[PDB]
Amino acid sequence: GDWPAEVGNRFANWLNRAVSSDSQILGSPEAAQWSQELSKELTMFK
């Protein structure tokens, strides 16, 4: 179980640093939301 939450976390950190408009900061709760989204879709494999 080490991989999915960490992959979702680092994916949402990549999406944090990649998507930052004139609304400059994106933040950590949005990071946790997209992290758990990809984490559900990665633990759906088994």
């Binding site: 999406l15 990649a18 998507v19 930052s20 408009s21 609304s23 997209w34 989204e37």
Partner: protein
């Protein structure tokens, strides 16, 4: 190609997500629908 030795829609999604959350039109359900769509 050699046997001895030799040697972008994701960016479109990221660009339209950034250009989508740049502007706001009344901040309703369809905005969150398109955000969930793009993510």
């Amino acid at each position: 190609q050699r046997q001895n030795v030799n040697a972008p829609e994701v960016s479109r999604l990221t660009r339209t997500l950034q250009r989508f959350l740049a502007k706001t039109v009344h901040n309703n359900l369809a905005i969150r629908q398109r955000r969930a769509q793009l993510v």
